Amino acid sequence: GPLGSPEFNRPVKRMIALYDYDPQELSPNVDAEQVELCFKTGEIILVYGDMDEDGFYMGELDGVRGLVPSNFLAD
Amino acid sequence: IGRRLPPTPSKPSTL
């Protein structure tokens, strides 16, 4: 809860992609091509902070940064 | 217009 000392918390996590994702083929979002990251099964995404209220993580992959759908990654 | 997740894949991962 809110009371007590801060706990250890990793601001960066590595997450394995379990499914291919090309926003142009699969995203329902009007701004997908601008803001979402493309990736392939087996690639690992570095994820920064928490998922947003829509379910996306801010991720990095091979020099490119963008939002990634949490439901395509291994939790 | 809000953002939402794509539909979740239903087939087992090929990984």
Author numbering:
A (entry chain A): 1433 to 1507
B (entry chain B): 1685 to 1699
The paper states:
RBP, via its second and third SH3 domain, is known to bind synaptic ligands such as Ca2+ channels and RIM. Drosophila RBP SH3-II and -III share 49.2% sequence identity and adopt the canonical fold of SH3 domains. We observed the classical poly-proline helix that allows for mainly hydrophobic protein-peptide interaction in all three structures. In summary, we find that the SH3-II and -III interaction surface of RBP serves as a multi-functional platform for differential protein interaction with either other AZ components or the transport adaptor and therefore, motor-cargo linkage.
Finally, in order to get a deeper atomic insight into the structural basis of the binding of RBP towards Aplip1 in comparison to its synaptic ligands, we crystallized the Drosophila RBP SH3-II domain together with both an Aplip1 and a Cac peptide, and RBP SH3-III with a Cac peptide. The Cac-derived peptide bound to SH3-III is fully defined in the electron density. However, the peptide main chain interaction with the SH3 domains is conserved. The side chain orientation of Cac R1687 is again different if bound to SH3-II or SH3-III. In complex with SH3-III, R1687 forms a bidentate hydrogen bond to SH3-III D1463 and E1648. A π-stacking interaction is not possible since Y1372 of SH3-II is replaced by SH3-III L1499.
